[PDB]
Design an enzyme around this catalytic site. Sequence first.
Site, PDB file in Angstrom:
ATOM      1  N   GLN A   8       0.824  -1.206   0.000  1.00  0.00           N
ATOM      2  CA  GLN A   8       0.000   0.000   0.000  1.00  0.00           C
ATOM      3  C   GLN A   8       0.859   1.257   0.000  1.00  0.00           C
ATOM      4  O   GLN A   8       0.682   2.142  -0.845  1.00  0.00           O
ATOM      5  CB  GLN A   8      -0.940  -0.006   1.204  1.00  0.00           C
ATOM      6  N   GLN A  32       0.872   3.778  -3.242  1.00  0.00           N
ATOM      7  CA  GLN A  32       0.320   5.123  -3.108  1.00  0.00           C
ATOM      8  C   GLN A  32       1.397   6.190  -3.214  1.00  0.00           C
ATOM      9  O   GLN A  32       1.111   7.311  -3.651  1.00  0.00           O
ATOM     10  CB  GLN A  32      -0.419   5.258  -1.777  1.00  0.00           C
ATOM     11  N   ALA A  77      -1.084  -9.972   2.942  1.00  0.00           N
ATOM     12  CA  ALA A  77      -0.241 -10.653   3.910  1.00  0.00           C
ATOM     13  C   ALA A  77      -0.698 -10.438   5.343  1.00  0.00           C
ATOM     14  O   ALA A  77      -0.055 -10.962   6.259  1.00  0.00           O
ATOM     15  CB  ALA A  77       1.210 -10.197   3.758  1.00  0.00           C
ATOM     16  N   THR A 119      -0.141   1.746  12.087  1.00  0.00           N
ATOM     17  CA  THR A 119      -1.429   1.094  11.907  1.00  0.00           C
ATOM     18  C   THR A 119      -1.460  -0.365  12.346  1.00  0.00           C
ATOM     19  O   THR A 119      -2.554  -0.939  12.420  1.00  0.00           O
ATOM     20  CB  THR A 119      -1.867   1.179  10.436  1.00  0.00           C
ATOM     21  N   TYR A 176      -3.002  11.134   4.439  1.00  0.00           N
ATOM     22  CA  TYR A 176      -1.972  10.283   3.852  1.00  0.00           C
ATOM     23  C   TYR A 176      -1.543  10.800   2.484  1.00  0.00           C
ATOM     24  O   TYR A 176      -0.370  10.682   2.106  1.00  0.00           O
ATOM     25  CB  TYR A 176      -2.477   8.847   3.735  1.00  0.00           C
ATOM     26  N   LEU A 187      22.509   6.426 -10.042  1.00  0.00           N
ATOM     27  CA  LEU A 187      22.352   5.387  -9.029  1.00  0.00           C
ATOM     28  C   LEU A 187      23.697   4.967  -8.455  1.00  0.00           C
ATOM     29  O   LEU A 187      23.821   4.741  -7.246  1.00  0.00           O
ATOM     30  CB  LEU A 187      21.619   4.174  -9.612  1.00  0.00           C
ATOM     31  N   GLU A 223      26.531   6.839  -8.436  1.00  0.00           N
ATOM     32  CA  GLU A 223      27.086   7.951  -7.675  1.00  0.00           C
ATOM     33  C   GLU A 223      26.460   8.023  -6.287  1.00  0.00           C
ATOM     34  O   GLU A 223      27.164   8.218  -5.288  1.00  0.00           O
ATOM     35  CB  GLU A 223      26.882   9.267  -8.434  1.00  0.00           C
TER      36      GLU A 223
HETATM   37  N1  LIG Z   1       3.658   7.500   3.509  1.00  0.00           N
HETATM   38  C1  LIG Z   1       2.746   6.522   3.514  1.00  0.00           C
HETATM   39  N2  LIG Z   1       2.836   5.534   4.400  1.00  0.00           N
HETATM   40  C2  LIG Z   1       1.834   4.635   4.262  1.00  0.00           C
HETATM   41  C3  LIG Z   1       0.801   4.643   3.353  1.00  0.00           C
HETATM   42  N3  LIG Z   1      -0.021   3.541   3.539  1.00  0.00           N
HETATM   43  C4  LIG Z   1       0.523   2.898   4.540  1.00  0.00           C
HETATM   44  N4  LIG Z   1       1.649   3.508   5.023  1.00  0.00           N
HETATM   45  C5  LIG Z   1       2.475   3.046   6.126  1.00  0.00           C
HETATM   46  O1  LIG Z   1       2.841   1.713   5.864  1.00  0.00           O
HETATM   47  C6  LIG Z   1       2.809   0.934   7.085  1.00  0.00           C
HETATM   48  C7  LIG Z   1       1.825  -0.196   6.916  1.00  0.00           C
HETATM   49  O2  LIG Z   1       2.132  -0.920   5.703  1.00  0.00           O
HETATM   50  P1  LIG Z   1       1.017  -0.984   4.560  1.00  0.00           P
HETATM   51  O3  LIG Z   1       1.585  -0.454   3.290  1.00  0.00           O
HETATM   52  O4  LIG Z   1      -0.252  -0.398   5.074  1.00  0.00           O
HETATM   53  O5  LIG Z   1       0.825  -2.561   4.404  1.00  0.00           O
HETATM   54  P2  LIG Z   1       1.068  -3.537   3.165  1.00  0.00           P
HETATM   55  O6  LIG Z   1       2.468  -3.379   2.701  1.00  0.00           O
HETATM   56  O7  LIG Z   1      -0.049  -3.369   2.201  1.00  0.00           O
HETATM   57  O8  LIG Z   1       0.926  -4.961   3.869  1.00  0.00           O
HETATM   58  P3  LIG Z   1      -0.359  -5.861   4.184  1.00  0.00           P
HETATM   59  O9  LIG Z   1      -1.533  -5.086   3.669  1.00  0.00           O
HETATM   60  O10 LIG Z   1      -0.378  -6.038   5.666  1.00  0.00           O
HETATM   61  O11 LIG Z   1      -0.154  -7.151   3.458  1.00  0.00           O
HETATM   62  C8  LIG Z   1       2.496   1.936   8.202  1.00  0.00           C
HETATM   63  O12 LIG Z   1       3.687   2.439   8.793  1.00  0.00           O
HETATM   64  C9  LIG Z   1       1.741   3.037   7.461  1.00  0.00           C
HETATM   65  O13 LIG Z   1       1.827   4.285   8.109  1.00  0.00           O
HETATM   66  C10 LIG Z   1       0.712   5.696   2.411  1.00  0.00           C
HETATM   67  O14 LIG Z   1      -0.139   5.867   1.529  1.00  0.00           O
HETATM   68  N5  LIG Z   1       1.752   6.608   2.573  1.00  0.00           N
HETATM   69  C1  LIG Z   2      -4.273  -3.118  18.658  1.00  0.00           C
HETATM   70  C2  LIG Z   2      -4.798  -3.161  17.225  1.00  0.00           C
HETATM   71  C3  LIG Z   2      -4.034  -2.778  16.220  1.00  0.00           C
HETATM   72  C4  LIG Z   2      -4.564  -2.817  14.788  1.00  0.00           C
HETATM   73  C5  LIG Z   2      -5.789  -3.250  14.563  1.00  0.00           C
HETATM   74  S1  LIG Z   2      -6.444  -3.306  12.873  1.00  0.00           S
HETATM   75  O1  LIG Z   2      -5.374  -3.454  11.887  1.00  0.00           O
HETATM   76  O2  LIG Z   2      -7.226  -4.528  12.641  1.00  0.00           O
HETATM   77  N1  LIG Z   2      -7.368  -1.892  12.589  1.00  0.00           N
HETATM   78  C6  LIG Z   2      -8.731  -1.799  13.093  1.00  0.00           C
HETATM   79  C7  LIG Z   2      -9.844  -2.584  12.411  1.00  0.00           C
HETATM   80  C8  LIG Z   2     -11.077  -2.502  12.857  1.00  0.00           C
HETATM   81  C9  LIG Z   2     -12.148  -3.310  12.139  1.00  0.00           C
HETATM   82  O3  LIG Z   2     -13.308  -3.124  12.335  1.00  0.00           O
HETATM   83  N2  LIG Z   2     -11.690  -4.318  11.206  1.00  0.00           N
HETATM   84  C10 LIG Z   2     -12.646  -5.131  10.491  1.00  0.00           C
HETATM   85  C11 LIG Z   2     -12.978  -6.369  11.323  1.00  0.00           C
HETATM   86  C12 LIG Z   2     -12.300  -7.528  11.120  1.00  0.00           C
HETATM   87  C13 LIG Z   2     -12.603  -8.625  11.858  1.00  0.00           C
HETATM   88  C14 LIG Z   2     -13.609  -8.562  12.811  1.00  0.00           C
HETATM   89  C15 LIG Z   2     -13.946  -9.800  13.634  1.00  0.00           C
HETATM   90  N3  LIG Z   2     -14.287  -7.409  13.014  1.00  0.00           N
HETATM   91  C16 LIG Z   2     -13.984  -6.312  12.280  1.00  0.00           C
HETATM   92  C17 LIG Z   2     -11.409  -1.635  14.069  1.00  0.00           C
HETATM   93  C18 LIG Z   2     -10.447  -0.958  14.661  1.00  0.00           C
HETATM   94  C19 LIG Z   2      -9.015  -1.048  14.133  1.00  0.00           C
HETATM   95  C20 LIG Z   2      -7.903  -0.265  14.817  1.00  0.00           C
HETATM   96  C21 LIG Z   2      -6.675  -3.693  15.727  1.00  0.00           C
HETATM   97  C22 LIG Z   2      -6.217  -3.654  16.962  1.00  0.00           C
HETATM   98 MG   LIG Z   3      28.216  13.385 -11.986  1.00  0.00          MG
HETATM   99 MG   LIG Z   4      -1.943  -3.838   1.627  1.00  0.00          MG
END
Ligand SMILES: Nc1nc2c(ncn2[C@@H]2O[C@H](COP(=O)(O)OP(=O)(O)OP(=O)(O)O)[C@@H](O)[C@H]2O)c(=O)[nH]1
Ligand SMILES: Cc1ccc(S(=O)(=O)Nc2cc(C(=O)NCc3ccc(C)nc3)ccc2C)cc1
Ligand SMILES: [Mg+2]
Ligand SMILES: [Mg+2]
Lengths: 123, 433, 415, 420, 419
Positions: B11, B15, B99, B179, B224, B252, B254
């Site tokens: 992600q 992005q 993942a 996150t 973001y 690259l 350098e």
């Molecule tokens: N600068 C920036 N950081 C981001 C962005 N999206 C996520 N992050 C950062 O990336 C970290 C989380 O990784 P993600 O990119 O959300 O996850 P992913 O690589 O898709 O991995 P999974 O979804 O878990 O399989 C956190 O530190 C976020 O703050 C974005 O659009 N910009």
């Molecule tokens: C400590 C901590 C760190 C990160 C997370 S989180 O990555 O999962 N983000 C997150 C998702 C939801 C949410 O409604 N998900 C959808 C979902 C999935 C599964 C079930 C059973 N119900 C709902 C709510 C709050 C957070 C903050 C949670 C706790």
């Molecule tokens: Mg040069």
């Molecule tokens: Mg992702």
Amino acid sequence: DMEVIELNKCTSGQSFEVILKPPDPSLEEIQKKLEAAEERRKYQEAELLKHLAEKREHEREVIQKAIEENNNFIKMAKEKLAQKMESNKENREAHLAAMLERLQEKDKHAEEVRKNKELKEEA
Amino acid sequence: MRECISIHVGQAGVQIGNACWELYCLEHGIQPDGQMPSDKTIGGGDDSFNTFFSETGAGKHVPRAVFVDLEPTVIDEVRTGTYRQLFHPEQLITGKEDAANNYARGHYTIGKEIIDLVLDRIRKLADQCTGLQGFLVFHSFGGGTGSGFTSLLMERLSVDYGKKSKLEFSIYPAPQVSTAVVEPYNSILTTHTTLEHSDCAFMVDNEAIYDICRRNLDIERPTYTNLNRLISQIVSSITASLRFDGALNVDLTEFQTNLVPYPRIHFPLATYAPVISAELSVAEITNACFEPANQMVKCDPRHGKYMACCLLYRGDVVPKDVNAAIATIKTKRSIQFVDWCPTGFKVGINYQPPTVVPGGDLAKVQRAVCMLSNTTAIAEAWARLDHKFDLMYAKRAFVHWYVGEGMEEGEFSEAREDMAALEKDYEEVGVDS
Amino acid sequence: RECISIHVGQAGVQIGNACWELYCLEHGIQPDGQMPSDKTIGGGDDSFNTFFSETGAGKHVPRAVFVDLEPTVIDEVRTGTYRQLFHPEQLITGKEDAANNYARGHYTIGKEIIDLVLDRIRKLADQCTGLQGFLVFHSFGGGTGSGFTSLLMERLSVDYGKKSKLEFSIYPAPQVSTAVVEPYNSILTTHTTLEHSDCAFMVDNEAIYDICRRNLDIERPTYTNLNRLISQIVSSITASLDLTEFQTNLVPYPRIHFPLATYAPVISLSVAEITNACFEPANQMVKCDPRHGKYMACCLLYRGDVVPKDVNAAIATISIQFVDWCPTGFKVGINYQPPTVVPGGDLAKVQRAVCMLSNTTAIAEAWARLDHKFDLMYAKRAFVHWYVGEGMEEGEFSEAREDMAALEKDYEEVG
Amino acid sequence: REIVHIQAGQCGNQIGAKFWEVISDEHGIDPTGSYHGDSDLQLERINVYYNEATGNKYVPRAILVDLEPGTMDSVRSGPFGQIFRPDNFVFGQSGAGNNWAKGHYTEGAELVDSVLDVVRKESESCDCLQGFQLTHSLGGGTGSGMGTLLISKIREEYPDRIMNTFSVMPSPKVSDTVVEPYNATLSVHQLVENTDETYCIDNEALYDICFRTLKLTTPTYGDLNHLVSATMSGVTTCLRFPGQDLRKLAVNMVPFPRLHFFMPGFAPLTRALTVPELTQQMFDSKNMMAACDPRHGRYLTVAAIFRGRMSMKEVDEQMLNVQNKNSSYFVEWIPNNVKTAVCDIPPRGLKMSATFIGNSTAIQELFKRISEQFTAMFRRKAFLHWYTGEGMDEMEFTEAESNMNDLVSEYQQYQDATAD
Amino acid sequence: REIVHIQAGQCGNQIGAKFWEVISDEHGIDPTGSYHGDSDLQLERINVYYNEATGNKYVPRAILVDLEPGTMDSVRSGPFGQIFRPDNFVFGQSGAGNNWAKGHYTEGAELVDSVLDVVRKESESCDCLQGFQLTHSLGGGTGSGMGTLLISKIREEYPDRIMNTFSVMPSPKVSDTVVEPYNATLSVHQLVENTDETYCIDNEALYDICFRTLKLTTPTYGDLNHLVSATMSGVTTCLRFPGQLNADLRKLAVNMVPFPRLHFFMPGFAPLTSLTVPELTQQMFDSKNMMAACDPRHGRYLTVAAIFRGRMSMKEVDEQMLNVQNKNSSYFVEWIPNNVKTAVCDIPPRGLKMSATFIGNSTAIQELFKRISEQFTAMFRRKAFLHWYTGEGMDEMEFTEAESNMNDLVSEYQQYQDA
Ligand SMILES: Nc1nc2c(ncn2[C@@H]2O[C@H](COP(=O)(O)OP(=O)(O)OP(=O)(O)O)[C@@H](O)[C@H]2O)c(=O)[nH]1
Ligand SMILES: Cc1ccc(S(=O)(=O)Nc2cc(C(=O)NCc3ccc(C)nc3)ccc2C)cc1
Ligand SMILES: [Mg+2]
Ligand SMILES: [Mg+2]
Ligand SMILES: Nc1nc2c(ncn2[C@@H]2O[C@H](COP(=O)(O)OP(=O)(O)OP(=O)(O)O)[C@@H](O)[C@H]2O)c(=O)[nH]1
Ligand SMILES: Nc1nc2c(ncn2[C@@H]2O[C@H](COP(=O)(O)OP(=O)(O)OP(=O)(O)O)[C@@H](O)[C@H]2O)c(=O)[nH]1
Ligand SMILES: Cc1ccc(S(=O)(=O)Nc2cc(C(=O)NCc3ccc(C)nc3)ccc2C)cc1
Ligand SMILES: Nc1nc2c(ncn2[C@@H]2O[C@H](COP(=O)(O)OP(=O)(O)O)[C@@H](O)[C@H]2O)c(=O)[nH]1
Ligand SMILES: [Mg+2]
Ligand SMILES: [Mg+2]
Ligand SMILES: [Mg+2]
Ligand SMILES: [Mg+2]
């Protein structure tokens, strides 16, 4: 006090002598030394060409060492990445195997619970 | 020739990738059609912007990039974006399940399902290149895809493309915008594996860019996209020397040679000046690049020695203005250099003015600079990460999610041990001779 | 009775054709080659024929060959005023010079060019029913004038043991010189050509410089100013014509064949006034101390309105010593026709003039200075690598030095 | 990515139906089953719980299960009854009579094969199945016994997908049935190993809120189910609404495999509340669906979800405030263990709402309560022949008791754990 | 007698482009290549640095070498960019990455052959070739690395020819890369063996000259390049103009280099600006006029060549030079009699009426190599940045051998200072 001998008088000029108080080479050795210098120059040229050849061989050695490092890096990357991938598969499938074996064991226990209900039904 | 392939993973990588490429399209004047009215050589030609863009027969300029995420919601937006028609539909690769914040899933379980497909498309891109420079890999440090798949990609890239230049633009975990809670795990894990396969890793910490957007743009709670728009400027500055004809350049190789004093010490932080809201000087922006407040990573440079500084300028700036500013900086007793680096500066200048997305909060400026400095102070960012890792690993918290996907606790132990060595290496390279 | 002139190197070529144009003006020979005074068109046995051969068309041609391993100086003769006086074969050039390096000019580039110069020199000699010998004009410091002249000297001897070879050599002067290696080149070229030269008239450029500035009142003389002045002293010396008389009358012992010439007067005076002027050190060709030195010979050649008694009176008036086995005296010659000069040249045409040719031990002074400067660099082997890099044995630097030491010692021996 | 819902037994089908009625209104789907909502955020993530059918009409991906066939007619009689597709009703001849062995081993095993058939056909039509959630109680015999058997069977068929449960724990304040401690202990024994997350819905809590707070003299099950439905809606918010999956929440909420029991909380219980009001009230023991004072334990992980139009800057400020202001109630060895989510869509009727999901060690209080009641009967082996007569042995009871005692032991060890 | 010019790397091509512009202006050659001057002396020895094109025009005997196309594209875009023969541009595209090893061993190998093919073709176009001159820096990768490699390769092919370099030495005051001490020490190791003379143009001196004694502002690269171009025009005056009577590369090399290794010269110009003959001679010997950052008073000249330009009294230059010699008698070696010699060419540079240049073989230049050795040691003691070189197949023995050789040179220059 100045005796002179009168000599070679002519239209162009005169000449005289006044008096005041009385009284093998070998060409082949030249060519030998010139050829020796040329031979000495030739010896110097060779030593330089030799010294240069050793430097070319060092350049080849350096390039070869670069190639060897890049190839070993590839081979060690390939073999380490494979190794941990296979281990990860053995581990992940071992966990799921044990999990399903424990899960099938519950299923057997349930069938035994049923069989014991049947045996007791004969009362 | 001299092409560079960008690989955006996860992600954060995707992005940020779409932010950079939008900025690229704005700089070179490429339209959302893929068309570029300032290029006369159709379907071919070796202009400097062609390092990052390929040319197709009908006049469309296609980016030399690959977007990969194990899950499609972020990438689908790119497919539905305003810049959809720039990419060949295959350049965007997406799996069905992500993942799930788990390095093991991205690197092993789920990653192996599309790794080969990703590597195949990278080879076709490389096939379109007459003289490949290297790769730019954009990823996060704490996501499953960003950590696990990136590390598998980098390992595969080293097998397929040898020691060819691989450079990273990585986002460092920041509690403020963090996150996931297993982020210290994923960060320590990917660093351990990509350490041997990376040539140089430009670091940014999302909280630092956050505080910068708050302080300098008067945004109460920066989005973001905001964070991403700044990073695009940083990336653009790093790549401007290769997409634009310029008096002074830094390629690259350098970057590698001047910023990495030792194989393991390849994590220079980023810094960028100036950041001005919509509603100057040359020495001012250089002086700003050394102020601790304006550092893209939560790091105090005054707590360490500078090992190398790369100052990349763009706009109304000529080398005499720079050398003067570097001279004034060379006097500053606040900035201390290691005694094994007597010549401590590398500089690139590109006279093409900066550019921002129209309507954004970032104001258009006439001169800008981005500094990439390798300083021993960055060991603090490693320390804060490792400590969080210690807090959970001592109780083995969450480790079961990684063991269930085939990982062994020995991997965690050796990864942290190597990270501790990285801390000790950053300490020892600061001792004076 | 004819003589053949050879000019080697820049100095030899430049002071060479300076002498030839003074000769043509002496005998009234025109730039066309024609000589209205010569009534035997197509040959003859006159005196000027010792230096000018005649063709069927009557053009008077110098018996000369110009050799330099580089062209920039010989082309000045090819495109000059007396250009038509020389066939195109008479002038020989390479394209690479000896770089002020004796060994390069002697052992390296000299081999490739000696055989051509020999064949062309013999073709000149085949135009001589009577050849008394050779005059060579060369420098001591120059690369080709040092190395190639040596090579040519020894070859000339083997191929022409009959005739005799006289030298007109330019002694290096710190005021007017171009190379720091000039002492090296000098020492080496002398040692190799001492046995092969019968007589050797040296000339210190500083002396010519000094008497030019002083006697002629000029702030700094051009190389041509010099060249014309030396040309007059050569003109007077060659105006004698036997090459046997010179070898025997001025040189009593072969190794000490380095006499000094003194021309006078140099105005821009009576017979006695000009004769005493030649006994003065400030008019001599090599800066030298005839005060201490003892003479061994003293030919006196006058030109102009000079009759015997004027000479005899002048000699009686003046008190220098002589070697005690040589007849203390003075051979005297007269050439009544006044000395000729360049029309508009820096020296005026005068009624009478004299050239003194004296073989004295004093000239050893000139040798010692050059030897000392040689000793300074060779002690640190400075610049020796350039010569050894051309195939020359380092031993030769010593063989030429110790022989040089003997020369001065033999000179002091007869003190 | 689709989720398959299963509701078993009386209670499970009751709260399951109320939940569907809630989210269907939230997504704007009438009993007929056609979309009549006003925005687009009601469809973008609707595939997760609904399956598109011909006629532009969505049908819940739900499977209704009970050994008592009457509950089937009750669900179809209730509002939004025809929205469920008839082929997903799997009913038996008669209920389990609160006998866990009947649901788990004997009568429930007869009906479980057809249930797994319906599950299979729903799972194969999914593009990428996330996992399953099961609503049930632990006091009776169907949702208790057969539910555990289901989640255990579904695990063998789908080892790598997520299993969530909404389990209703028994309370003497709600039911006088005496063997409920037996059934709850046996099913918890199953839940500890076979599920990834379990939401402990305490009938003792639900009763206390309606009485001591909502001020209801004699609350019916329908009063309590209103609470369960509002929590279940609030817990599933981000699942059913774009912008703000199963495995991720489980990965972030569960630091240790067995400790996957979460205390839910909703605010308000029933002038829009303020974010500071919602925040404080949400961490209050009076707003918890489990009869566990979180001040009696420590938070391992906490996930909050806010609903309605509000500035997320204030949401952050308050969430950090309550964290530091009550620092001691969060383990120091899990950094950033409290995360927060905000979704603009508020529940039906409420303009402002907040749901709390907490992995807290204070939930050991609930399990202790069950264990004491269980122990009081097992020591005199009261009523055991009802389970022994079905083929069960006494040692299974002993294993369930000790495993549940281990669970509360673990919870207390981590409660007393130190950063060093 | 003709010379083939080669320019390698960023610095080498930039100073090379400005050198050709300066001497094309002196010789009356415009950017198209055709003559348009007011004196036939601008053509007497024009072949020395030029070839007659068929279209009434002249083409420099210049070959342009770089591992990156940018510099070349820039010099082609310059005012005199049209003058150079197009096939004489030899570029790669991998670059050297500021790395001496890539320029001398890995990358530079892939380009050095086709460079020689141009070196060969232009040598077949010469009636008598004197030798080669190379412009390059020592701090980078292309000019330093490939330049030494190139120099060694042409020596193998033309061993009997004179090789000179105009080599810019790195300084922190104006830096391109952090590894300049490595690149400089590594290449000095080579110039001690495969060149007959090198004019050490020190970027430290250039900077100091442009800053302090010139304008007290910050200098651009054009200012630094202006100093070295003019200096180069001065050193080459007698080769391009008649009347010298001793104007060949070999002559100067035999006169100025008493020992094979001590062939490193301190150039000097006068006046420095963007006069009287006394000032011309006196300033010429001032350290504020030295294009190498070394004080002549810290050592003794071994041999010195001065060239004066502009119409002036020949006796004035003579006596002036004689008395600045005898005024500082002890700052010349006594065991080399008459070690300073002068030359005058009445054609002065374009911009001034009377100028003067200086070529000194002095022991004081040890100070230059010393600065390099210290900075090199500051890095090598910690093995800093070294992995970028060994990763290219290089060993550390080559670095130690290189520094020990440069230290040996420092000792050798000092040894003859005490004699
Ligand atoms: N600068 C920036 N950081 C981001 C962005 N999206 C996520 N992050 C950062 O990336 C970290 C989380 O990784 P993600 O990119 O959300 O996850 P992913 O690589 O898709 O991995 P999974 O979804 O878990 O399989 C956190 O530190 C976020 O703050 C974005 O659009 N910009
Ligand atoms: C400590 C901590 C760190 C990160 C997370 S989180 O990555 O999962 N983000 C997150 C998702 C939801 C949410 O409604 N998900 C959808 C979902 C999935 C599964 C079930 C059973 N119900 C709902 C709510 C709050 C957070 C903050 C949670 C706790
Ligand atoms: Mg040069
Ligand atoms: Mg992702
Ligand atoms: N009097 C006089 N001396 C000259 C003349 N030309 C050169 N010299 C001197 O001769 C010495 C140099 O010898 P050159 O004749 O120039 O050299 P070369 O014989 O051509 O040899 P290279 O040029 O070294 O190959 C110096 O001492 C010069 O001062 C000249 O025309 N007249
Ligand atoms: N909150 C709530 N609890 C309920 C409801 N219905 C039953 N319960 C509780 O669930 C337990 C009884 O389980 P049931 O669901 O009735 O039993 P079952 O799963 O149908 O199994 P059997 O009836 O034994 O075949 C007791 O603790 C009841 O208080 C309901 O609608 N709401
Ligand atoms: C101590 C000493 C004694 C004699 C000489 S010298 O014989 O060479 N004459 C000499 C020539 C020039 C001159 O510019 N030559 C052309 C040239 C050759 C090579 C290069 C690279 N640039 C230019 C300048 C001054 C002198 C005095 C030099 C030094
Ligand atoms: N004087 C001067 N020095 C330069 C110029 N360009 C680069 N340099 C210097 O050259 C050294 C780096 O070598 P460079 O030519 O840039 O690297 P290369 O491309 O690998 O040959 C550093 O000391 C720079 O200061 C220039 O135009 N003028
Ligand atoms: Mg194009
Ligand atoms: Mg000559
Ligand atoms: Mg006749
Ligand atoms: Mg029932």
